[PDB]
Structure formats: structure tokens, C-alpha cells
């Protein structure tokens, strides 16, 4: 009766993330890594490992999949952002990804990660140039009052999905200049499904300051109808 | 002051039921233009279902499964962690009564303020308020008659509740059923999940008659096996 | 067989051990021809049809449901039971030229009536749902129902064979349905909510 | 007077990158009208990808595979066979550079005319003119450092180019990757393709970790097993 | 064993296959004589390659039955006295057109053109009303030496080489009102890969040629490539 | 009910679409496709996929007889006779059908087509050559007809095909031919020889 010798963690803590912030390359269970060429037709055509979140960057985990990466690439090339703000850092993968990418395009960009819990961050202390971390909860806006003068243009991204609309109002009133993005990843389609009448009303409240950018907005399952930018 | 839309994940934005309102078509299509009528549903299909004017979050396939399960087991108690609007509570009571079964339905939740069942229709339904994370929410329960079906719809602290139920509640043949979450937990944490479930190998089995019979019950229908 | 028998698993044990959870097969374990039921009687109405009928019953609150085509009576017991628990005073009536196959015992036979044969006597209370489940001679019965039976609001419903009639003879189907343009309409809240009632839910208009 | 439209098969009509254009919707959509906004990409998806303003014919899925492979292998050499606009060359040289890998990137093509890489942005990238019909092209690969990834993206004389790579170029753990074409060679020449591949059974295995990970690499990632 | 071979250029087989002769596909993972007790547990899948499995009289047919059904209608309606095919290969299509016009009682000459007739598998026994010409498509002389043809006429492009110049020729020197010029296969690919130039080139013939809408959406292979003289 | 063939007519779009508006043309079929297939101006209730399976079958088997329960307007019969004739096979095509009237096939096109009137064989059916294909296209009394053919008609190698009604217990003297069973939706699991 192994269960009574056992206490059980709560598995909800792994929703959208997984058991480990550390990256580990996948592993073939039911087949050799080296399939021989005489039997090439008989090889299995499926992936061989879980496609839940297999993506990485320089040995850090990456929760933004390749289609998303192509959109952010295009968006960086066009906008040439002076600042990027990730909300929800997790393991640090996409922070390093944004900083490395702006560096290669020759863009002088400051990458800023905010989070509840930076203990999960996996970025070498040496590989941290042009990056700044901030512990703080989205749930209360002082996390954003406290930080200051960011250069523009500016991309603000919500991967945390918490207090999102109050943060969006904070951003329009106190941060975003014309042409700056505010991107809500993953979540906007679910909120519409679960709460159509409230979701539409909330989005609509921003009818005069934010518009959805139809050039990037339909270009990845993750950014799906979530890519917004400042007007007026 | 924007409400936090996460609150509504899996539930909806209003516990009260309202019938679908057609938006780009009249209710009455003229038969001379029968073929040109749009063949799609017409409404939002997120949780369209009802039972006597109360919302139903269990879709029709799931309901078919429970009908069969109730018919075979003939449970004398049904317990639901997660009550919400009460739809499924009243359904269970209503169905067991139609089948002639003497069944108490008990419902447990940390917030009962959303319940929509009129007290005139509360016969054989017992609501208790508690948090899954406190185990006393369960130790406070009075003796229950068997067979019994324990259903997790709240998904918090689920495995320690399984440990509790195996040890203090379930007689052989009784069901501990986890709706919806098993496939997600397995996707997000495949190893931990496997080890956890497997730790119940001696006391619970997966019932294959039902475990593949509905999208919501999928791989979550479990029963107390002989010691 | 009209009698109901639970599904039997030929390739799986019913009790799959938890230590091998991931290895369990994901398909249903048996045929999905007609595995539905209601209190030990067979139900040919799949769960989506059940839901539409539930909804229909709840808003209309029918005084009379008439089922042309009975088979074994499970749908008849379902209508009666469901109308009882909603509080609706409803008379289920079931008409088939052959009734031998009917499994309902004479005890829970309250508010149910069987007639055998074609055409007759309706001093029956409205609102009414008429369900054509005997897929022969349909458009004739539809004219017959509009001339003798149907009042405003009342439904006439064609299960199963509607999309098949547009498949085989499309020109005639449309003409034959378009002949009732002035009397019946297609209720678009239910007419797309089930494969079995798909585009077969009609109701008297005026 | 009409050009041979077959020339553009797989490539496109201009090797320079032109950003996509929205055919029938404004770029800004009013947020009060969000539910009504269209849902499909909004332009042609044939080959809309890019790296630093140059076209990339490797899509994001292929890009992710190569990243993984490059992180693990840490190749001292990558040889693209068939160049076109040079997008891949620029990309590989960049990805290795960020990754702290000291990597040479060689492009080989009969036609280097359509290469769009500026001369300023050309460190660790060398280009060689030459035909796959003839093997002295590859013979002057001046024993570049290892490990090495060799990729076929032109597809002429490909099986002879492989017998050569095995005997004179490749070492244990080096890659030989045929993009796009292997599933087409198997559809069309089931018998012959299956003989030719497999004639290399003692010298090359298919690496299953990367071999089913994108459409373009599908059943095409091979490596030297000595 | 790799050193002990010289490999053919497998591109040679693009859209053709490796063998002009028809070989009937055989089952691999199962016998052909399944038992009737096990009728339920027999699989739904075809059981073979599905690439270009079709045939006519022991000759490989590269036009799939869907495309074949629409030519049957087109021949029946128009009743052509001449059918030109560019791209012959095994001669399957040639013999099919010939056999179908004949069974339909039409006096139709089929004419097949190709740079390489070595691959043709039609017995001479069954060569009636078939005229082959060897010539390269990117070479207007190939067409200039074509004798007079009776009308109506259906001209079909299966070689897809120098195609637009050939339409220009066909429009200037062959096609009378009613006649068809039909590009099979290539058109969708040409619109994925060169949408600007393809649109420009087609609109060049706007005044002389039209997309026949009764046939052009009707098979995968003819999809958007069926055209005729206004 | 219409046994005669009529070519589909368009509705919303012209037949002649301009090539300067080529990219904008409608990509859908433009008309219903219940069964708009003909052979030589006669309707025909074979998909092109079914047409191709039978073709392969006639070419391999080379039947000296084809029987066909249900005829309708005669397409199949003419088609079969024409196909065996083009293939040089000496085949007789028998069409059996209770309502013979529908048959549009004209007298001058009947060589190797014999029609018999009747309901589902039972007499007025004489000795015929093999190999034989037998086709049930009229799905009443289909199973008694199987045993009867199995006991009085089918020799080894001969087929018996059920056409349309086979998704909706004979292992000793029959078998399912797996080369053609899956190859078309209309013959889904209906192709059974010996
Ligand atoms: N209320 C809250 N306030 C701040 N951070 C929160 C939060 N709720 C969740 N989070 C954080 O949100 C993160 C989501 S994962 C972040 C994904 C990452 N930006 C990438 O794309 O690679 C977690 O690290 C979690 O700790
Ligand atoms: N820790 C916790 N303890 C008790 N209930 C909780 C909880 N966390 C969430 N819940 C409750 O879980 C419920 C689950 S939704 C219930 C589903 C519905 N009654 C059905 O039968 O299908 C919500 O009402 C929520 O209030
Ligand atoms: N016989 C041959 N010898 C050398 N190069 C050839 C060749 N045939 C075709 N090519 C070249 O092959 C190239 C194919 S496109 C190259 C694809 C691109 N490098 C990518 O990353 O996907 C063309 O540039 C063409 O010039
Ligand atoms: N330029 C050219 N001139 C004449 N024939 C050519 C040609 N290019 C290719 N062909 C020949 O014509 C055929 C065209 S390629 C094969 C076409 C095939 N029927 C299809 O549509 O997919 C081959 O038989 C080839 O030998
Ligand atoms: N029970 C029965 N006895 C004899 N004929 C029948 C029959 N049931 C249906 N039929 C006839 O069989 C025909 C079936 S339709 C036959 C279609 C034919 N194979 C084709 O492709 O063209 C109809 O003409 C109908 O009149």
C-alpha cells in the first residue's frame, strides 16, 4: 500500500509548465536512436517523445514554440524595441531568447523579467547582460509602480495571466507610448470561451487606446488574437 | 476594477441558466428555403446543457455513462466535491429517484453561494461547506450508506483525498472518479502522476466499462477493489 | 434483440491495474451501434437527441407526446419519466403496426398508451410533440397531422431519415417540404443540435 | 514573353525578402469588434519566414531541430549544399555564434548570383561555385574541423555525393542530412531508393531523435556510425 | 556495398515512378483470402502505396478515376475529332482516349507528343488512331510541323515545359472556337510559387481563353487548369 | 426519381470565367454530387473509385459472365459489356431487375446483354460460363441468394459482390478478397470470391 507511506504534492502547480524548470533532452523509449538503413521503411513515423514542451534555448527551457518565435522575430525586426517586459519568467528561457535575439539584430534592448518566484530561474549568472529580474506579484500594481523609465519602443508581454486587465489599464495610462505592444499570450481565446459577455466588454473598454494587430495576431496558436498595440 | 476572468475557468460567467439566444438567424426558418438554412449550431456550445432549468456542466455523453453506472451499482450515496450551481446534484437525486433507488446526494464546496437549486427541490441533497485542503472537511462527514460514488469535480488536493477515501470511506465496488483532470495532469507531469496513481495499485482499479466512454470521465473512473 | 444487455469486454479485463495505467487501451472496448438505454430498456436515442428532447420538453411543457414507431418502449418510458420529474402532466402515446417487441412492464405503464396500426381518435390535449420514428410514408402523415392534429406551437419531428431524403431525391424533397411553407417551420434552436434530429424539427406556426 | 515558371519551384520568384501584405483587412482591428475579426493568417503561407531581413526556406520546426542538434553536437563545420539567397548560411553562422561554438559555414552552389547576404555580414561564411555533377567541387573542402554537418538542399547526384562523404569527409558522429526530398524519392522509386539507402547500412544510421521532428527533415537526418 | 554501385538520378522519376510497365500491387502484411469469421477484425486501410496505382488494359494510367470521369463527360459533350497530349510516357492515356472516343462512336484521332517515346508500352495490335511525335516542348518547331487537325479539339499539357509559349502558339495556329487547352497538375503549384507572374501570364490570354467552370473544379489533377476558346 | 441522364447546369457563376479575375474564382464543385456520373449519355451509379476497382477485377479475372441484380437505366450493363469488349474478353452480361422499364439501353447496343425480369434466378435462368462475377445491387433477400449461388452457380475463383449495404458467417466456401475490399467506399467490405 504505497499510498499510505506517501504524501502527494498538488499537480495543479505544473499546469502549463511541467515537473522541472531545468531542461533535459528527450529520450527514446521504444526504439534505438540509430535506426539502420536496411530497414528504413519500417521506422516509426511518430515523434517518439512527448511534444508537451520540448523546446529549448542554449540549454534553458523555452515555453514559446517555434511558430511563436517566428512572430516575435518579425516583430523585433520591424519594431526594433528598446525594451521588452516579460511577465512570468519561470526558468528564464524566453528572457535569454529575447536578449540574445535583439543583440544579433544589433538592437540595444533591455529585457525585463517580473515574477512571483525567481528561484526557478536557470540563467547562468554570467549570461545575464542586458537583463533585469524583479520579484513581485501581478496581483497588486505596486510591482509596476516601483520600476521605472524604460526606453521605447516597448513590448510588454503577459505570460502570467493574473490581474491582466488592471495591469493593461496601468500600462496604457502610465507606460505605453504609440506603437508599443501589449501582448497577452495563450489566454485570450479561453477567456472568450468561458466569459464572452465580460471578456468582450473588457476588451471593448480599451477600444480607444489599443487595437489588435492583424499582421501578427493570427500567426501562432499562442499569440492567437492576443497581440495589441497603443494608438492615439 | 476588472474582475479576474480566471475565476470562470471551467464554469462560465453566470451560475444561473439561460437558453441559447440565436444571433444571426431567426428561430423559425421558412420551409420553402429549407436547404439554405445554416447547418452549424448557432450558439456558443461551451456549456449549453441543462437539467430542469439548471445549468449542467456534465455533457450528454457523461450523463449516459452515469445513467448506466447508477443502473448497475444502484448507489445509496453519491458525493460530489465541487457543487457550483447544483445542477448535477439535482440530476443525481432526480435520476436515482426515477430508478426507484434510495440515494442521498451530498455535495461539498468551499463556496455554496452559487447554488441555484430551489429549497422546494432540495429533497435528499446535503450541502457541506469546506476546503479540500483541510482534511477535516471529510472527517466531519457522517456515516454514509453503500454502495457509494465519490466524484472529484474540484481537483484540489485530490490525491490525499483519495488516500482518505480508500482508508476511511470506500467499501469494495465503490467508485472514486476524477472528472476532466487526469489527461491534463498526465500531460503536464507524466512521471509524478504515474507514480502517484500506481501507488494505489493494491486498492483501486480503473474501470474499463466506463473509463473510455466519455471525454470528461476519460481515464478517471476508478473503483475500490477487494483488499 | 429488443431486450437490453450490458456491453461485454472481450479484449480487456474490466479492472485495469493502476500500475499499468498508461498502457490501457483508449478506445471504447465495444461496438457503438446502439449501446444506450434507460432503466434496463433499450434507447435508440443517442445522448444528443436526449438533450434536445429534454430542452424541448422543458420550454414547451407538452400535454401530449406521440411516438410513431415504438420498437421496445424505452424512449416511451423516457418521455413519461422525464415529463413526470419536470412536473408536466403529459400523456405519452405510442403507435406501431407491430408491438410484440415492447419490453415495458404493466406496472410502470402509467401515463403511457399503446395503439397498434395506422389510422383515429384524438381528444388529446395540447401542446403536442409528434415524432415520426417509423420512417415510411412520412410526408403523408405530415399532411395528416397538419389537417387533424397540430395546433400553434406544437412540434412535428422527423428522426433519422431527413438528410437521407435530401441525399437520394433532392429536387422532390425540397418541393415536398416547401409545400408546407405556410404551416410548418424549422426550429433552428434544435434542428442542428443532433445528428438524429438534424434538420427534422418542425412546428406549426399559424 | 514567358519565363520558365518551373525555375521557381520550391523557391519563389524573388530571392530577396518582401514582408507579407494584408490583402483584405486593415492592420488595426477595433477592439469593440474583436469577435468579428478574421481568424486565418491573412496572407500567403508558401514561404513567409525570415532571418534579419533575409528569406529562410527552413521553417520554424526545422529551425528548432537544428538548434537542438547544434547545441548537442557543437559542430565545427556546417556545409549547406545549395544556397539560393544565403538565409540559411547567415542563420547557421549566427546561431553557432550566440552559442559560443567556433563554426565554419560553407555554401556550395552552381549559381551564387542570388545570394542576398551583404559582404559586411559575412564572417565564418565561405561560398564555392560548382556543380554536383562533378565531385572535385567537394574534394577541395580542405579538411574542415569536426564534428561536421553536411546538408543537401540542391538534390542532384545526391547518392554519389554521399558515397564520397563517407570515404573522404565524414567521421564518427558527423551528420549527412537530405532535406525535403527523401519521402518523394520513396513515393516515386520505392524499389530503387530503398536499395540505394541501405547500401549505406554499415556506414550510416538514421537519427530518430531528429528524424521525425519536422516535415522538411522527415526521414532525412543521417549520421556516421563508424 | 555502397562503393559497389552507381546510383541513378532519382529525380528522373518525379511524378512518373520507376517502371513504365504496370505491375499489379500485391499485399505485404496479410493474405488476400481473409476468413469470413474474422470479417470484423480485418483492417480498413487500402493495403498498398496509393501513388499511381491506376491502369487501363494493363497499361499504367496517371490520370486518377476522378479526372477520368470528367474527361468522359467532356468527350461526350464535345465529341472531339482530335485529342493532343503533351507528355506520353507509357501511352496509357493515349490508349484510353482512343478507346473511349471509339466506344462512344466518335471519329477521334489521338496524337501524343514527347521528347522520349522509348517508354511507350502500347502493343501495335492496339495502335489504331494513335500518332506519336518525338519533339521537345521548348521548341516551337515541334508544333510547327503538326499537320491539319479536325475539330473540335482538346489539347492537353502533361509535360509542363515551355507551357505559356505553347498556348500562344496554340491560340495563334490551332484553336478554333470551342477547343480546349488544358493544363493538368502544374497550375496550383505555379500559383503557390510565383503568384505575381502566373496571374500576369494567364491574364495575358484573357480575351482569347476562358476557364470552363463545369469541369475546372472537378478533379484534383484538372483543378483550375481547364480552359477553352471563349 | 429520374433514370435518364442530365448534365449538371450551373447557377450562380458563368461557365466562362475570365482569366484576369482567375485567382478569385470559386473553388467548390459548383453542383450536388449524389451521383452525377454517366456512361455514354446513360446515368451510372458507380463512383469513379468503384469503376476503377471493377476494371482491375475484369482485367485480372477475365470473366465469361457478369450478373447484375438491379439495373435501373442500364449504365452498369452497357459499361461492363463495353469494358470486357475493349479488353477482348468474351463476356455475357446478364441484368436482372423487377422493373425493367427504366432501362434506356437501345436495341442496337445489346450485343452480349440479356435482360431477365423478376424479383429477388428462381427459374428462367440457364447455364452460363465461368469465371463469373455476381453483383447484388438490389439488397433484398441478399443472404438466401448467397447460399443459392454458393450451391448452384459459383465455382472456385468466382466473385460475389454486395454493393452499398455491407457496413449497415460463411468461412468454408467463400472468402473476402483484400485487394479490392478496401479500395473503394461503395464496395466497402462487399467483395468476396470463391
Ligand atoms: N500572480 C502572479 N504574479 C507574478 N507571477 C506569476 C503569478 N502567477 C503565476 N506567475 C508566474 O508566471 C510564470 C508563467 S511561465 C512564463 C513563461 C515564459 N515567459 C516563457 O515564455 O518562456 C510562472 O513562472 C509563475 O511563477
Ligand atoms: N480547494 C477547494 N475546496 C473545495 N472546493 C473547491 C476548491 N477549489 C475549487 N473548488 C470548487 O470546485 C468547484 C468545481 S466546478 C463543479 C462542477 C459541476 N458541479 C459538475 O458537477 O460538473 C467550484 O464550485 C469551486 O468553488
Ligand atoms: N546540380 C547542381 N549543382 C549545384 N547546385 C545546384 C544544382 N542543382 C540545383 N542547385 C542549387 O540548389 C539550390 C536549391 S534551393 C536551396 C535551399 C536553401 N539553401 C535552404 O536552406 O532551404 C539552388 O540555389 C540551385 O542553384
Ligand atoms: N520539355 C519536354 N518536351 C517534350 N517532352 C517532355 C519534356 N519534358 C518532359 N517530357 C516528357 O513528358 C512527360 C512529362 S513529365 C510527366 C508528366 C505526367 N503525365 C504528369 O502530369 O505528372 C514525360 O514522359 C517526359 O518524358
Ligand atoms: N427487390 C427487388 N427485386 C428486383 N429489383 C429490385 C428490387 N429492389 C430494387 N430493385 C431494382 O434494382 C435497381 C437498383 S439501382 C441499380 C444501379 C445499377 N447498378 C447502376 O449502377 O446503374 C432499381 O432499378 C430497382 O428497380
Contact A138 CB / ligand 1 (< 6 Å): yes
The reply to whether residue D162 touches residue E2, judged by beta carbons under 8 angstroms, is yes
Q: Is C130 in the same domain as C200?
A: yes
Q: Is B21 in the same domain as B84?
A: no
Q: Give the residue among B43, B121, B113, B126 at the shortest CA–CA distance from B77.
A: B126
Minimal Cα–Cα distance from B112 to chain A, Å? Answer: 20
D38-44, Cβ contacts within 8 angstroms, sequence gap of 24 or more? D38/A214, D38/A218, D39/A218, D39/A225, D40/A218, D41/A218, D41/A219, D42/A214, D42/A215, D42/A218, D44/D20, D44/E192, D44/E195
Distance of alpha carbon A87 from alpha carbon A185, whole angstroms: 10
Pair D136, D160: CB distance under 8 Å: no
Q: Is residue F122 classed as helix, strand or coil in its secondary structure?
A: coil
Whether the bond into E104 is cis, omega within 30 of 0: no
Q: Mutate which of D17, D22, D28 to disrupt the A interface (most A C-beta within 10 Å)? A: D28
Where in the sequence is the domain holding A29, given as residue range(s)? 10-63
Question: What is the number of the ligand 5 atom nearest to the C-alpha of F75?
Answer: 22
- Specify if E102 maps to a domain: yes
Q: Is B39 in the same domain as B107?
A: no
DSSP code of residue B218: T
Q: Is B37 in the same domain as B120?
A: no
Pair C97, C118: CB distance under 8 Å: yes
- Specify if A230 maps to a domain: yes
Closest ligand, as measured to the CA of D114: 3
Q: Is E115 in the same domain as E68?
A: yes
H helix intervals, B99-157: 136-139
Domain stops at, among E22, E45, E62? E62
Quote the distance between the C-alpha of residue E18 and its chain's center. 17
HEC assignment per residue over E2-44? CCCCCCCCHHHHCCCCCCCECCCCCCCCCCCEECHHHCCCCCC
Distance of alpha carbon E49 from alpha carbon E55, whole angstroms: 14
Residue C9 has phi, psi (to 5 degrees) of: -95, 115
Domain stops at, among B57, B78, B101? B57
Residue E129 has phi, psi (to 5 degrees) of: 70, 25
| C-alpha cell recorded at residue E5 | 554501385
Q: Is B46 in the same domain as B129?
A: no
User: In this structure, which residue's CA is closest to atom 9 in ligand 3?
Assistant: D154
Residues 6+ apart with CB under 8 A from F88: none
Pair F55, F82: CB distance under 8 Å: no
| C-alpha cell recorded at residue F44 | 451510372
Q: Is C29 in the same domain as C52?
A: no
What is the number of structural domains in chain D?
2
Distance of alpha carbon C153 from alpha carbon F183, whole angstroms: 50
Distance of alpha carbon B12 from alpha carbon B32, whole angstroms: 38
- Specify if E4 maps to a domain: no
Q: Is D49 in the same domain as D77?
A: no
The reply to whether residue F32 touches residue C170, judged by beta carbons under 8 angstroms, is yes
Q: How far is the CA of D186 from the centre of ligand 3 (A)?
A: 21
- Specify if A5 maps to a domain: no
The DSSP string of B18-74 is: -----SSS-SEEEGGGGGGS--S--S--SS--EETTEE--S-HHHHHHHHHHHHHH-
- Determination approach: X-ray
Kindly identify which residue of chain F lies nearest to residue C166, measuring between CA atoms. F34
Specify the pairing of strand A110-115 against strand A83-87: parallel
Pocket test for ligand 5, best of F40, F47, F49, F71 (most atoms within 8 A of CB): F71
Q: Does C contact B via 3+ CB–CB distances below 8 Å?
A: yes
Q: How far is the CA of E61 from the centre of ligand 4 (A)?
A: 14
Q: Is C38 in the same domain as C127?
A: no
Q: Is E56 in the same domain as E70?
A: no
Q: Is E191 in the same domain as E135?
A: yes
Contact A137 CB / ligand 1 (< 6 Å): yes
Residue A150 has phi, psi (to 5 degrees) of: -105, 135
The kind and range of the H/E element at F177 are: strand F175-177
Q: How far is CA B207 from CA B155, B177, B192, F24, in A?
A: 20, 10, 21, 55
What ranges make up the beta strands (E) of chain D?
28-29, 50-51, 54-55, 77-81, 104-109, 125-129, 148-152, 175-178, 204-207, 221-224
Distance of alpha carbon F112 from alpha carbon F104, whole angstroms: 16
User: How many contacts (CB atoms, under 8 Å) link E and F?
Assistant: 137
The reply to whether residue B188 touches residue A16, judged by beta carbons under 8 angstroms, is yes
Q: Give the residue among B124, B222, B129, B219 at the shortest CA–CA distance from B173.
A: B222
Q: Does C contact D via 3+ CB–CB distances below 8 Å?
A: no
User: In this structure, which residue's CA is closest to atom 14 in ligand 1?
Assistant: A88
Q: Which residues line ligand 2 (CB under 6 A)?
A: B 10-11, 57-58, 80, 82-84, 88, 109-111, 131-133, 153-154, 156
Minimal Cα–Cα distance from F131 to chain C, Å? Answer: 34
Q: Is C112 in the same domain as C29?
A: no
Pair F124, F118: CB distance under 8 Å: yes
Q: Mutate which of D1, D6, D23, D43 to disrupt the E interface (most E C-beta within 10 Å)? A: D6
Closest ligand, as measured to the CA of B156: 2
- Specify if E43 maps to a domain: yes
F128: CATH: 3.40.50.150
Chain B residues touching A164 at Cβ < 8 A: 2, 4-5
Amino acid at each position: 500500500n504505497d499510498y499510505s507511506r506517501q504524501n502527494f504534492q498538488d499537480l495543479n502547480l505544473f499546469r502549463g509548465l511541467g515537473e522541472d524548470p531545468a531542461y533535459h533532452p528527450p529520450v527514446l523509449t521504444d526504439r534505438p536512436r540509430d535506426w539502420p538503413l536496411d530497414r528504413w521503411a519500417e521506422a516509426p513515423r511518430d515523434l517518439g517523445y512527448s511534444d508537451f514542451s520540448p523546446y529549448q534555448w542554449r540549454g534553458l527551457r523555452m515555453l514559446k514554440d517555434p511558430d511563436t518565435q517566428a512572430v516575435y522575430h518579425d516583430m523585433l525586426w520591424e519594431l526594433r524595441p528598446r525594451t521588452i517586459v516579460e511577465l512570468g519568467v519561470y526558468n528564464g528561457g524566453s528572457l535569454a531568447w529575447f536578449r540574445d535575439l535583439t543583440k544579433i539584430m544589433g538592437i540595444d534592448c533591455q529585457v525585463i523579467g517580473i515574477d512571483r518566484d525567481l528561484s526557478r530561474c536557470q540563467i547562468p549568472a554570467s549570461d545575464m547582460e542586458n537583463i533585469t529580474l524583479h520579484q513581485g506579484d501581478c496581483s497588486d500594481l505596486t510591482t509596476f509602480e516601483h520600476l521605472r523609465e524604460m526606453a521605447h519602443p516597448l513590448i510588454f508581454i503577459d505570460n502570467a495571466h493574473a490581474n491582466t486587465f488592471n495591469i493593461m489599464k496601468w500600462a496604457v495610462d502610465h507606460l505605453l507610448e504609440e506603437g508599443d505592444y501589449f501582448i497577452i499570450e495563450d489566454m485570450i481565446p479561453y477567456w472568450y470561451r468561458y466569459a464572452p459577455q465580460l471578456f468582450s466588454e473588457y476588451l471593448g473598454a480599451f477600444r480607444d487606446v489599443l487595437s489588435m494587430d492583424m499582421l501578427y495576431a493570427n500567426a501562432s496558436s499562442q499569440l492567437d488574437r492576443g497581440v495589441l498595440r497603443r494608438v492615439a
